[PDB]
């Protein structure tokens, strides 16, 4: 189920609207130079050993953090980071850290969209922030299925 999980993860990632594909390291730094702290995007990694990279503005400038995928689990770069949580879903990973800085670790706040999300998707995002009990909502089955397709808050 290893390849099947990565395929599902990449479908979600295409659904995020903040995946910048083949953006170069220099292009990512140029895009985030003046962005607020916490602003982030995901792009392809240029390194042979890694699939993806998170580009994020820190108080010291834009930086890059590669994402490992091993044994069917996603985790942040273990060469840089060391109780590192693992995730079936990489969008879930991002969501996890995003929520983690709404409490108190990795400071991620607002994604950098490639283009304007659809209104449907923004409504889905808003509803996910309010409840996980999508089935209990006064909505038609077709829209619950749509909500079911993307359960994350970012």
């Amino acid at each position: 189920q290893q390849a099947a999980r990565l395929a599902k993860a990449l479908r979600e990632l295409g659904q995020t609207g903040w995946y910048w594909g083949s953006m170069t390291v220099n292009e990512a730094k140029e895009k985030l130079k003046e962005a607020p702290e916490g602003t982030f995007l995901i792009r392809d990694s240029s390194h042979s050993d890694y699939l993806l990279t998170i580009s994020v503005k820190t108080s010291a400038g834009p930086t890059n953090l590669r994402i490992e995928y091993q044994d069917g689990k996603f985790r942040l770069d273990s060469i840089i980071c060391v109780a590192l949580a693992a995730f079936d879903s990489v969008v879930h990973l991002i969501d996890y850290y995003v929520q983690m800085c709404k409490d108190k670790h990795l400071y991620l706040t607002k994604p950098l969209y490639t283009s304007a999300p659809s209104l449907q998707h923004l409504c889905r995002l808003t509803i996910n922030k309010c409840t996980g009990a999508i089935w209990g909502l006064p909505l038609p089955t077709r829209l619950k299925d749509y909500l079911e397709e993307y359960k994350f808050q970012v």
Partner: peptide, 11 residues
Amino acid sequence: LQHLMDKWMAM
């Protein structure tokens, strides 16, 4: 993103 599928399949 079939490019990423094949990159993982390679490595």
